[PDB]
Every structure is written in structure tokens, then in C-alpha cells.
Amino acid sequence: MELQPQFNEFLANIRPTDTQKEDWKSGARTLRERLKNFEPLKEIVVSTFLQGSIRRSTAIRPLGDKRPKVKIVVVTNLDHTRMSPTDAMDLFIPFLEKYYPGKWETQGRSFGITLSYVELDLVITAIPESGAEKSHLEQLYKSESVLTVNSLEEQTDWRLNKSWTPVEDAPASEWKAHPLVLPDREKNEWGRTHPLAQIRWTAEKNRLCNGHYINLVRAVKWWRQQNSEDLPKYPKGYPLEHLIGNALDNGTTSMAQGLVQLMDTFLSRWAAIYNQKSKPWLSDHGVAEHDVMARLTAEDFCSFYEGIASAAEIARNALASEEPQESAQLWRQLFGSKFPLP
Ligand SMILES: Nc1ncnc2c1ncn2[C@@H]1O[C@H](COP(=O)(O)OP(=O)(O)OP(=O)(O)O)[C@@H](O)[C@H]1O
Numbered sequence: 453m454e455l456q457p458q459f460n461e462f463l464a465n466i467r468p469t470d471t472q473k474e475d476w477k478s479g480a481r482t483l484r485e486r487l488k489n490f491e492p493l494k495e496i497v498v499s500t501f502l503q504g505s506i507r508r509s510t511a512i513r514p515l516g517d518k519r520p521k522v523k524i525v526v527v528t529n530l531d532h533t534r535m536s537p538t539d540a541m542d543l544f545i546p547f548l549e550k551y552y553p554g555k556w557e558t559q560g561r562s563f564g565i566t567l568s569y570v571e572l573d574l575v576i577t578a579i580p581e582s583g584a585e586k587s588h589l590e591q592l593y594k595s596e597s598v599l600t601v602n603s604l605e606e607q608t609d610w611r612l613n614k615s616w617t618p619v620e621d622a623p624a625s626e627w628k629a630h631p632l633v634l635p636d637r638e639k640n641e642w643g644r645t646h647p648l649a650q651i652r653w654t655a656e657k658n659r660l661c662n663g664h665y666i667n668l669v670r671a672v673k674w675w676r677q678q679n680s681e682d683l684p685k686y687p688k689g690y691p692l693e694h695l696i697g698n699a700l701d702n703g704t705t706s707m708a709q710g711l712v713q714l715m716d717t718f719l720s721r722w723a724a725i726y727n728q729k730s731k732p733w734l735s736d737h738g739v740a741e742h743d744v745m746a747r748l749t750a751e752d753f754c755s756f757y758e759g760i761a762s763a764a765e766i767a768r769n770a771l772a773s774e775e776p777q778e779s780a781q782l783w784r785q786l787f788g789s790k791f792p793l794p
């Protein structure tokens with residue numbers, strides 16, 4: 453059966469606790485307030501906004517004592533053609549030493565701030581556009597739509613529009629073709645990322661799937677976490693979320709039907725790629741030219757495909773079972789101890 457109440461309880465059990473939520477909310481608010489009132493950066497920092505699976509409501513709670521990774525984007529007005537990423541990041545060392553001495557480090561393209569209950573991951577970005585387009589983008593990044601600390605799940609009325617207040621999405625000509633530039637992973641060069649586009653696409657897909665998309669992402673992340681020793685190291689994180697969003701059809705009815713449908717569509721759609729021992733090329737919702745599966749290997753994708761085949765057999769039988777305890781036993785075989793029984 454579908455067992456929708458049990459699925460709701462499982463989702464509530466795999467969400468980050470309200471404690472951790474308030475923790476990263478307070479951390480982000482404090483960092484933003486300190487950045488806004490820092491004199492040497494008052495002419496540089498355009499905005500500071502939350503991103504990642506936390507804001508997109510696609511994050512699962514950490515294990516053990518592990519801190520929740522809080523991803524923060526710092527939008528500046530620097531010229532990326534005349535400054536390397538290391539210059540932009542060096543601009544922020546005084547702020548860190550003043551407000552987080554002994555707590556901050558450089559993790560390649562990000563700043564890692566180890567706080568008491570959370571870890572703040574700060575990426576330093578810039579706006580490639582100039583003139584009126586740059587001013588309009590700065591106005592958008594300083595709007596309440598971007599500066600919100602609540603996740604997508606906490607406000608279904610959220611849209612990507614500078615006039616939104618806690619109204620539809622803004623037309624695509626105002627944000628789609630305008631990504632930020634961030635530091636590259638290895639090289640000291642600027643790459644392109646569009647987190648706002650990703651968040652807006654996630655919200656749209658969740659609305660098209662009747663609020664089941666982010667929950668299905670959480671469920672598949674929890675499944676991958678519980679069966680980690682049988683599954684490949686990757687995909688996990690955003691590439692996994694993208695695979696799930698690609699596999700899921702619109703108009704999702706329930707958690708169980710949506711899960712079975714997404715697993716079936718994943719299996720049938722990539723069967724040719726699997727038999728060719730290859731990997732899909734999937735366009736990023738933020739930067740169209742980017743392959744989300746660029747760093748994923750073919751062997752890992754095929755191992756994940758086999759794992760999805762097994763999980764899909766189990767989920768099909770869990771959905772087909774007409775006895776509640778039987779369906780629940782199969783759903784727990786897929787999801788583990790934190791799935792409740794009727
Ligand atoms: N911490 C982050 N914050 C915002 N965007 C990110 C972050 N990490 C990755 N991205 C986006 O996702 C993509 C994944 O890039 P990854 O770090 O896996 O390899 P890369 O060498 O940076 O990619 P490329 O060379 O293709 O730009 C990046 O192009 C970037 O646009």
C-alpha cells in the first residue's frame with residue numbers, strides 16, 4: 453500500500469530537527485548582519501544569502517554528532533576579469549579574523565567556519581554583468597526573495613521575484629541567463645554558478661509534483677545513506693538530487709507511487725547508458741552548459757543503477773502489497789529503522 457501517514461512520519465523523522473534549523477538560521481543571520489555592518493566591505497559585499505540543500509529543503513539530518521553544513525553565498529560587485537578568486541577571498545580575511553578567530557579555514561573555493569552547533573560554508577561570488585543589468589541583479593539579490601533564511605518547505609508561497617513578501621516567478625529574461633561567478637574547485641579561475649536558478653527550479657518542480665519532490669529527494673538520500681556499504685560512493689548530494697529530479701515525472705500523487713515511478717523511469721531511461729558502461733550528460737538547471745555528472749564516473753553510475761534496480765524491485769513489491777504491515781516491512785527494508793509501522 454501507499455501508507456501516506458507512515459511516509460509523513462518517516463519524512464518528519466529524517467528532516468533536520470527544529471533545533472538544527474534554528475541553529476543554522478541564527479548562524480546565517482549573524483554572519484549576514486556582521487558582513488552588512490563591516491566598514492571595509494561595505495562597498496563590496498552586495499548580498500549574503502543561504503543556499504544548498506538546506507534552503508531547497510532537500511537536506512537530511514546529519515548522523516551522530518556531525519554538524520549541518522550551512523552553505524552561504526556572498527555576492528560582491530568585484531571585477532572577475534581583473535581579480536582572481538584568491539584576491540576576492542583574501543578581501544574577507546580581516547572580517548573572519550575579527551569575528552571568527554581560530555574558527556575559520558580555507559577549504560579550496562569555500563571558507564569553512566566551525567561554529568558551536570553548525571558549520572558555515574561561505575563562497576565568494578561576483579556579478580559578471582555591468583551597468584543597468586548589474587544594478588538590477590544587485591537589486592534582486594538584495595530583495596526579500598533572496599535574503600530569506602526560511603527554506604522552501606517553510607514557505608510554499610515563495611517565488612523568485614524582487615516584489616515577493618512572506619505573485620508569480622519573475623520572467624526568465626531577468627535572471628535565467630545571468631549566473632554568478634565563483635571560484636573553481638582546483639584552478640585559481642572563475643567558474644559560473646546560478647544557485648537562484650537551481651532553487652527556483654526546485655520550487656517549481658515541487659509545486660508540479662504536489663509538494664512530493666523535496667520529500668522524495670530526502671527519502672532517496674536516506675535510502676542511499678542506509679545502504680551506503682552496498683552502493684557506490686557517488687552520486688550523492690546535488691548530483692543525486694538532480695538525478696532524482698530528472699527521473700520524477702510531474703503530477704506526483706503520493707510518496708510511494710512517486711518513488712516507484714521515479715525508480716522505474718530512472719531504470720528505463722538510462723538502461724542504454726548502463727549497457728554501454730557510460731554515464732548521462734545532464735544539463736544543470738542553473739548553468740545550462742554545465743554537466744552535473746561531470747565528475748561522476750561511469751562505474752559509479754552503473755553501480756548506482758544496479759542498486760536502483762534492487763531498490764525498485766523492493767519498492768514495487770512494497771507498493772503492490774495490500775496488507776499494511778507487509779507494505780511497512782518492505783518499506784523499512786528499503787529505508788531502515790526510522791520508518792514507522794502502523
Ligand atoms: N559551493 C558551491 N556553491 C555554489 N555553486 C557551486 C558550488 N560547488 C559547485 N558549484 C557549481 O556546480 C558546478 C560543479 O563544479 P565542481 O566543483 O564539481 O567542478 P568544477 O571544476 O568547479 O566545474 P567546472 O570546471 O565545470 O566549472 C560548478 O560549475 C559550480 O557552478
Ligand SMILES: Nc1ncnc2c1ncn2[C@@H]1O[C@H](COP(=O)(O)OP(=O)(O)OP(=O)(O)O)[C@@H](O)[C@H]1O
Nearest residue numbers: 503504505506523650688689690691736743744745
Ligand atoms: N555538480 C554540480 N552541478 C550543479 N550544481 C552543483 C554541483 N555541485 C554542487 N552544486 C551546487 O553547489 C551547492 C553546494 O555544493 P556542495 O559542495 O555543498 O555539494 P553538496 O554538499 O552535495 O550540496 P548540497 O548541500 O546541496 O547537498 C549545491 O547545493 C548545489 O546547488
